[PDB]
Amino acid sequence: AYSVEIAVQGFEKRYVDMACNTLGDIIILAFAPKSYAALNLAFGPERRDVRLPWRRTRITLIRGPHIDKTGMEQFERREYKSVLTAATNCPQELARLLEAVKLYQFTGVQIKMQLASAQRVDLPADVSALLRXXXXXXXXXXXXXXXXXXXXXXXXXXXXXXXX
Amino acid sequence: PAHLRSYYPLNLALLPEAARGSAGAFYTPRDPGHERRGGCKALQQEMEATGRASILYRPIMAALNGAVAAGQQPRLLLTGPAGCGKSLALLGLVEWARQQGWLVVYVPSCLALVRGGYFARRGRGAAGGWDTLTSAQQLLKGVMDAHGPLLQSLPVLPVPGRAARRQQLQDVALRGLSSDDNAQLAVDSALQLIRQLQLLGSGAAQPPDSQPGQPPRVLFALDDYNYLYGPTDYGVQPPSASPLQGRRRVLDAGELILARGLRLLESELGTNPVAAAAAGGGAGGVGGAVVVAATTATPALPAPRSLALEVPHTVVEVPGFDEAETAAALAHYAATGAATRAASAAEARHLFALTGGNGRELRAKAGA
Amino acid sequence: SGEAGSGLAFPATSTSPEPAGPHIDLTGVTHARGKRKASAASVQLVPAGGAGITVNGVPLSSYFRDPACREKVLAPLALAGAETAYDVAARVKGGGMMGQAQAIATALARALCVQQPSLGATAGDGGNGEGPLAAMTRWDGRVVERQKPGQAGS
Amino acid sequence: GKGDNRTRRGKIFRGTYREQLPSH
Amino acid sequence: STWKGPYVAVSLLQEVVALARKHPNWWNIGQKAPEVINTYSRASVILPDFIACRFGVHNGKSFVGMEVQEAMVGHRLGEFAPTKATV
Amino acid sequence: XXXXXXXXXXXXXXXXXXXXXXXXXXXXXXXXXXXXXXXXXXXDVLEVLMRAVDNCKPLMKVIQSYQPRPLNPDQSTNFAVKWILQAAQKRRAGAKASMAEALAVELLLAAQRKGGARARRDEVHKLALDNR
Amino acid sequence: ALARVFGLGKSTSLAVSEACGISKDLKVKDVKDSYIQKVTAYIEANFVTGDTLKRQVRENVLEEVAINSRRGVRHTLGLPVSARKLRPL
Amino acid sequence: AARAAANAAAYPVDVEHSFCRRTRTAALSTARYGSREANRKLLLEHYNELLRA
RNA sequence: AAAUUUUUUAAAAUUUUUUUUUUUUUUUGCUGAAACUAGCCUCCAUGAAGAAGGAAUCGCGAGUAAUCGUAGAUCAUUAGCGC
């Protein structure tokens, strides 16, 4: 019971496009029934490829070096986004995914990844006794992504708890 | 019912405070044309518009008249969009009951209860409150000019069961009107009239020298009710700061005494256990002071546009001006000279869709 | 059904693109969309004597609460002469008040077009046609010109 | 000042009617 | 600035404690304190008492000698060290 | 029949006249219409406005040199309501009451073939006849 | 509604009127003189008559120029420290 | 007299209790220690302390 | 604990009055080491000219002028008017 979200950031639409297509190839390979003989596949209708617009902000400059206050010119940064959606139930192929994105290097393009997943929780027996139903899936971990030699293939990975 | 969707003229002699230069009684007489225009503001608008006094007979006022004559609910709320059948319908009910000769206290605009006029402190404490001389005294003069003979006809009835507490009507009105430098007297006289009219409508104290003859029916009409719930205009200096640093502790509606006493829907004293015993709460026991308030969508000071009411009561929405009576009102405007011309069926449907039931802007578009 | 391209690019100094169609849905309720500003709006039209007219949830006379703006809402409806008999269900987004009015006017016009073909303009026959309401179908997609990358300089 | 010091309007001109968010 | 710490006069105080070898303010009320006090910074505030002290304040070109009296007690010393733009 | 809406709307837009809400000028001009009703029956409104504006139509315009030019009558309406309104601000700044009263009394007087709008109006009529 | 006193400003004006009980929408042609005695008594409970204050600030900046201080020569010079037409002198 | 609904402030840190009505879910987040697992330890203790109510 | 406060010569507000413990949320002049010159904020008080501006002249014809906010930069804070 694991859910994966991959967010992807770029400057040239070419590179974020190739990134989206190659990770889509990886997902479909990663849960691929390559042979019939074992038959719990997740193409449930959660699955998407949601595209996204950007953060419109223009940053302008003086053209001239000295007096030149007539001399303006406009400049501009672009960020292009996609999100990649899947989820699955066994962990060994999830590890194949994480090691797959560990190997294939992508040019100029940020990988931010969301991994909400189920993980079991010990309780002191007092609160289990004093239990005797809603979602309450609240871990939401957080990690840094810079100033320590990483050009941002950061993985964030909130967690979902279960203790009935 | 044959008067349906028509106009009818208004007996203005039954209405003393409706159009009159209200606040200018107890001030200087003003510069002419400078008069502080209180009174019934919507009927002043209808008066300056058509040149006359006539209102359109909507069936919701017919249900209002039948319910008020019924006595099957003495506590009604009217709420709808601004002036759209509150002030018109309320004053129509007042004139209707005054053709039945009932005993009426009608506040024309509760804004004038809570705006302006010289004031003072009464007492200290939680029950200690605020008193405005002019607002209560204007209420006195309106009531006394409204029902002078009937007010003089009724003598001072003793209090139900608070004679045990103290042991442990034109009299009082003229007691209140007499002076303008002891305001606590005036406002206390006002609310003494309030409880004595509630007692008289209860039927608790029938006079020994009176005939077998039924008492005058108590009707209290309150236009723009929730000015008794919004914050006021009167403020005070807080006790902490210097007067130089004086931020204003603005006084509230519960901090007044008179309007707090004027909270009739929240008052228990229309639900009188004396009237629950002597009249029995029965359909033949119509013995409660039937009280009606309507409040607007346009407060002049920040009142809530709804009333979160704890006390049970019946609410009735005022519906908007439906298509037939918009055509009839436009025909009336074609009569009175406010219009130049008759309206088409297309333009009547157009105006109906336009103002949505707002009366005052329907009056505004009448030349068009 | 066979709808087609209805859109236009009418404006000066900045173009426009309202790619949304107007269409009737199988509930007997047509839906249409309209923007005349970058602020935008949609409509949904039921032939009914129910709640009448509705944008943004509320009845109209408090949301829009200038009268001239109200007849800017009602102007295609008043031009039609089919005022009463439809429930008007509608949604809006953006901008300023009478821009919302004339936008919702255009959308109401489009829904009325798919209700009655000849009153207003459509793409049923090659994106052409003529009725009284055919003028205000194609939206007036002029936006503000851009605040000039340059000077007052005076 | 367009009523800069004491109004419900000129204090949006002096950036105070918008209360400054706590940031640093 | 009275909130959360109202007074700053540290270097002035080091010189004041240098004066305070027999009396900070004529405890031995005031007698002009003939030893000159010459500060090097005028950002300093003035503290209550400190009367009859010969203060030499910097102007960026010299040291300006001014005797303090009872009125200038709630002031900051740089108000008495101008740039002399008289005309 | 729609020219009533045309002349009224041009009256509104020329009454806007400084940057503001045409709602403000629109309620102002409708207030002028109602004040025209009040002063007219005091000591019959679209009627008197249509008569006033049709009294005020400058049919042939002149261009200085002096040469007359024929004029499309919509600009005749448009000059017309213009001359009305600058005369209105003349009278109102001289009165410095509201503007609604001033535009009302001017629409009455230009209906009555009198006032500075009528003066300017028929002198440029006759001066168009002069220089042919 | 004494937005009308002159030797004071407006907020203290409505303060003094509130301190004897005058609300808004009252005119100066509508106050009986007992309240005038009350408000005058409250004026010497408050501070009085801004020309008394103008005398007061005359000795205040007299004190400041008696200090040989450059804001004193501002006040003998008329320079803005933030229209030398008006001065406090 | 105006403020944004989303204060989104700063110059502080917390456990950020929050609920999402869209999916009927509570949300608590991590902020105190540098590593993720130390924060998992802190919020796990906070979850146990949450259930003492 | 309980059925008390406030007027005139007969009334009025409460059924909550008076004690102890509590308790939040704002509030604090702000930011900086230091705000006199020379910052900024808030609130008092004093309330100037100015009642539309000559000769002369500039800019701009549709979502334009004007008017109205809004947010970004540099920035500890200081842009109210600058961009």
Side-chain angles (χ1 to χ4, degrees), chain A, chain B residues 1-161 163-164 169-368, chain C residues 2 4-5 7 9 11-12 17 19-22 26-154, chain D, chain E, chain F, chain G, chain H residues 1-2 4-6 8-10 12 17-53:
Chain A
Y2 314 100
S3 66
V4 64
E5 294 293 328
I6 297 169
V8 61
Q9 180 262 2
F11 297 89
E12 185 162 349
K13 186 183 287 185
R14 210 159 194 132
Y15 293 101
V16 65
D17 273 335
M18 310 275 308
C20 173
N21 295 115
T22 188
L23 275 70
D25 178 51
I26 296 169
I27 307 314
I28 301 299
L29 259 58
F31 313 127
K34 321 166 292 286
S35 63
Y36 199 87
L39 59 86
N40 289 49
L41 266 172
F43 286 110
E46 287 198 342
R47 192 191 171 215
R48 291 164 188 176
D49 187 7
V50 178
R51 273 320 191 270
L52 189 65
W54 65 280
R55 183 199 164 201
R56 277 77 178 273
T57 286
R58 289 194 196 180
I59 302 299
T60 187
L61 294 174
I62 307 158
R63 294 172 260 200
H66 275 53
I67 298 169
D68 311 325
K69 271 289 197 142
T70 65
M72 295 299 103
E73 182 145 90
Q74 294 202 350
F75 292 96
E76 191 276 331
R77 186 204 296 90
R78 282 176 161 170
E79 306 174 85
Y80 302 156
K81 304 311 300 213
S82 306
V83 285
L84 295 205
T85 61
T88 187
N89 61 6
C90 319
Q92 59 203 329
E93 68 275 16
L94 174 69
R96 197 206 307 272
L97 188 153
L98 272 192
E99 288 157 12
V101 66
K102 188 148 49 65
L103 275 296
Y104 270 131
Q105 313 303 20
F106 305 130
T107 43
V109 172
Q110 179 191 32
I111 301 299
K112 169 210 293 167
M113 209 193 259
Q114 293 302 30
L115 277 297
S117 50
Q119 193 55 340
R120 274 176 46 81
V121 174
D122 65 90
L123 303 196
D126 67 353
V127 303
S128 88
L130 276 296
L131 193 170
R132 199 182 305 117
Chain B
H3 319 108
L4 259 183
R5 309 185 145 81
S6 315
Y7 283 52
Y8 48 90
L10 309 173
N11 194 357
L12 302 188
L14 287 170
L15 277 297
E17 200 66 287
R20 185 280 301 190
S22 162
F26 291 157
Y27 304 160
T28 187
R30 296 196 182 275
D31 316 314
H34 281 54
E35 301 90 4
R36 180 194 297 150
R37 298 303 298 161
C40 183
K41 207 92 184 174
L43 267 297
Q44 281 172 40
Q45 286 201 336
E46 300 271 339
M47 183 278 288
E48 61 86 20
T50 76
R52 292 140 31 87
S54 48
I55 56 178
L56 181 62
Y57 186 80
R58 309 180 64 195
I60 193 66
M61 294 183 286
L64 175 62
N65 290 318
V68 172
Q72 293 184 355
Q73 187 35 248
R75 314 271 191 121
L76 276 296
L77 182 63
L78 278 298
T79 310
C84 80
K86 296 174 289 298
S87 313
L88 290 181
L90 183 63
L91 212 49
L93 183 63
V94 165
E95 187 172 276
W96 181 65
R98 278 160 176 281
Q99 291 182 357
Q100 309 311 300
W102 288 12
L103 201 42
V104 175
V105 175
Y106 162 64
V107 174
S109 188
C110 295
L111 183 63
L113 295 175
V114 302
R115 181 183 107 176
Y118 182 76
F119 47 84
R121 182 72 52 52
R122 175 180 284 171
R124 60 89 174 174
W130 289 95
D131 295 304
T132 73
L133 181 41
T134 72
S135 301
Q137 194 175 6
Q138 282 266 343
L139 172 44
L140 260 63
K141 189 179 186 307
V143 168
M144 171 294 287
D145 273 8
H147 287 296
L150 197 45
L151 183 63
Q152 188 160 31
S153 72
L154 298 162
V156 183
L157 313 182
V159 64
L169 267 296
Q170 211 190 47
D171 293 331
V172 187
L174 287 162
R175 173 97 197 179
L177 286 179
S178 66
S179 295
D180 281 18
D181 51 344
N182 186 281
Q184 64 183 177
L185 163 75
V187 55
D188 189 358
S189 313
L191 53 83
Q192 183 151 338
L193 275 295
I194 300 299
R195 278 154 224 151
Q196 201 57 266
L197 275 296
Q198 287 168 311
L199 189 152
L200 192 146
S202 76
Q206 293 296 138
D209 307 325
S210 287
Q211 290 174 1
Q214 307 319 303
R217 293 199 56 177
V218 173
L219 183 63
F220 292 173
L222 277 298
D223 180 341
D224 292 331
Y225 195 29
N226 52 356
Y227 285 130
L228 282 72
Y229 296 95
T232 68
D233 180 42
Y234 319 107
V236 292
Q237 174 176 140
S240 44
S242 166
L244 310 168
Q245 309 169 353
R247 176 142 275 285
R248 310 273 204 191
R249 187 184 89 100
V250 290
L251 299 176
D252 262 351
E255 287 180 352
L256 276 296
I257 297 170
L258 61 84
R260 181 186 74 217
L262 277 157
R263 294 200 189 163
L264 270 62
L265 277 296
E266 282 153 27
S267 181
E268 66 180 1
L269 287 170
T271 52
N272 289 318
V274 187
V286 186
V290 171
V291 288
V292 165
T295 187
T296 182
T298 186
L301 280 186
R305 285 162 50 198
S306 183
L307 276 296
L309 294 174
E310 54 188 352
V311 176
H313 61 285
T314 301
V315 294
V316 166
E317 61 86 20
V318 185
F321 273 22
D322 186 74
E323 301 218 67
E325 72 256 27
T326 56
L330 274 169
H332 180 263
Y333 283 121
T336 55
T340 176
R341 67 160 180 86
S344 81
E347 196 165 1
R349 278 181 297 273
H350 174 273
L351 264 179
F352 158 73
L354 190 144
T355 79
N358 189 359
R360 63 197 300 160
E361 298 172 32
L362 191 69
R363 182 202 311 126
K365 298 293 183 182
Chain C
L26 207 49
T27 51
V29 176
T30 184
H31 60 278
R33 279 151 185 166
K35 62 180 68 180
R36 187 251 171 267
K37 190 262 172 180
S39 177
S42 70
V43 288
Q44 195 68 252
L45 265 292
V46 176
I53 191 166
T54 291
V55 298
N56 207 1
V58 65
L60 187 152
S61 179
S62 77
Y63 179 48
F64 294 102
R65 63 99 178 193
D66 179 74
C69 190
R70 264 84 61 85
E71 76 256 10
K72 260 175 151 84
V73 176
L74 294 174
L77 183 62
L79 187 153
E83 290 54 37
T84 299
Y86 325 111
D87 189 359
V88 176
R91 177 69 274 171
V92 69
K93 224 152 201 183
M97 51 165 88
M98 42 165 178
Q100 322 307 122
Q102 55 192 358
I104 193 66
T106 61
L108 188 153
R110 298 268 171 129
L112 201 54
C113 294
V114 176
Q115 187 158 72
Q116 200 281 333
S118 64
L119 183 63
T122 181
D125 44 353
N128 202 0
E130 172 40 34
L133 187 152
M136 295 299 103
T137 62
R138 295 303 105 198
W139 61 98
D140 172 80
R142 65 197 174 102
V143 299
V144 65
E145 292 180 353
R146 179 63 169 190
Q147 190 275 331
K148 304 93 161 183
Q151 312 152 85
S154 178
Chain D
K2 217 168 43 185
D4 57 4
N5 61 8
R6 298 176 262 258
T7 43
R8 65 144 306 270
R9 187 196 294 231
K11 296 179 52 64
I12 84 179
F13 176 75
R14 302 296 269 115
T16 311
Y17 187 103
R18 289 213 240 94
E19 263 61 28
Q20 172 255 327
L21 206 141
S23 175
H24 184 274
Chain E
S1 311
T2 65
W3 48 272
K4 323 299 134 165
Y7 315 134
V8 160
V10 49
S11 280
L12 181 55
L13 192 55
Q14 302 155 19
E15 206 177 335
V16 162
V17 302
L19 181 140
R21 58 196 198 277
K22 49 190 191 320
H23 39 77
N25 294 280
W26 291 95
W27 292 85
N28 290 165
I29 183 66
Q31 204 53 36
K32 192 258 301 177
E35 316 90 349
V36 70
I37 296 306
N38 192 326
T39 181
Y40 200 61
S41 63
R42 63 190 207 267
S44 48
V45 309
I46 304 301
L47 269 162
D49 191 8
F50 283 65
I51 65 171
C53 296
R54 300 292 303 179
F55 286 111
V57 298
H58 192 59
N59 50 7
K61 81 165 311 178
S62 52
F63 287 132
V64 185
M66 182 178 297
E67 179 48 81
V68 53
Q69 52 86 28
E70 73 278 12
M72 71 290 278
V73 284
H75 290 58
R76 290 178 267 208
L77 187 59
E79 170 57 53
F80 324 109
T83 65
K84 320 303 192 289
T86 70
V87 292
Chain F
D44 206 28
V45 285
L46 277 296
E47 293 82 3
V48 61
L49 171 142
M50 281 324 317
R51 171 133 64 83
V53 66
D54 207 308
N55 200 42
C56 277
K57 293 313 193 309
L59 291 203
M60 288 323 101
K61 81 169 205 180
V62 66
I63 191 166
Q64 93 293 20
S65 172
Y66 263 49
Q67 307 304 118
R69 295 293 168 260
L71 183 62
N72 190 359
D74 61 357
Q75 293 83 18
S76 305
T77 67
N78 201 0
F79 285 111
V81 64
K82 194 135 181 164
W83 321 117
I84 296 169
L85 293 174
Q86 292 84 19
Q89 322 323 319
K90 284 291 320 303
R91 194 211 290 241
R92 178 190 158 214
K96 298 287 96 176
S98 89
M99 49 66 76
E101 61 86 20
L103 192 172
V105 65
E106 271 195 39
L107 62 84
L108 276 296
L109 294 175
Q112 286 187 9
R113 275 75 175 274
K114 201 159 60 181
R118 190 53 143 148
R120 183 193 288 260
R121 154 161 293 301
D122 288 336
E123 62 77 10
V124 68
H125 284 86
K126 293 179 179 179
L127 183 62
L129 272 294
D130 291 331
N131 287 261
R132 189 153 44 258
Chain G
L2 282 176
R4 282 83 58 85
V5 310
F6 275 10
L8 278 68
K10 57 169 293 300
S11 278
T12 187
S13 181
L14 193 154
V16 172
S17 78
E18 181 155 328
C20 297
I22 297 169
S23 67
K24 292 321 271 191
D25 319 303
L26 276 296
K27 293 300 150 199
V28 65
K29 295 103 191 169
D30 279 326
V31 176
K32 314 174 195 297
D33 62 357
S34 70
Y35 307 146
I36 301 299
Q37 302 305 312
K38 279 181 161 180
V39 298
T40 60
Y42 189 77
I43 300 299
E44 321 88 352
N46 204 328
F47 182 75
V48 66
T49 51
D51 49 351
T52 289
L53 183 62
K54 186 174 174 65
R55 183 210 63 261
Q56 189 275 331
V57 66
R58 274 220 191 270
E59 69 272 15
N60 176 39
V61 299
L62 182 63
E63 166 190 359
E64 194 268 320
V65 66
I67 297 169
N68 291 318
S69 55
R70 65 159 212 149
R71 273 162 63 91
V73 298
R74 291 315 161 85
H75 276 172
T76 70
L77 192 148
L79 183 63
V81 308
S82 159
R84 55 214 92 171
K85 163 154 166 185
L86 283 184
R87 295 181 174 87
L89 292 172
Chain H
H17 175 274
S18 63
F19 187 85
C20 180
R21 289 283 324 293
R22 301 177 181 179
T23 178
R24 313 246 70 253
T25 306
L28 268 79
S29 51
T30 66
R32 203 169 282 249
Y33 304 150
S35 175
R36 279 183 276 179
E37 307 322 290
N39 285 38
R40 183 262 305 284
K41 182 183 77 74
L42 196 136
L43 271 75
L44 188 51
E45 180 181 289
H46 267 73
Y47 174 86
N48 289 321
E49 192 278 339
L50 159 72
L51 289 188
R52 316 283 317 275

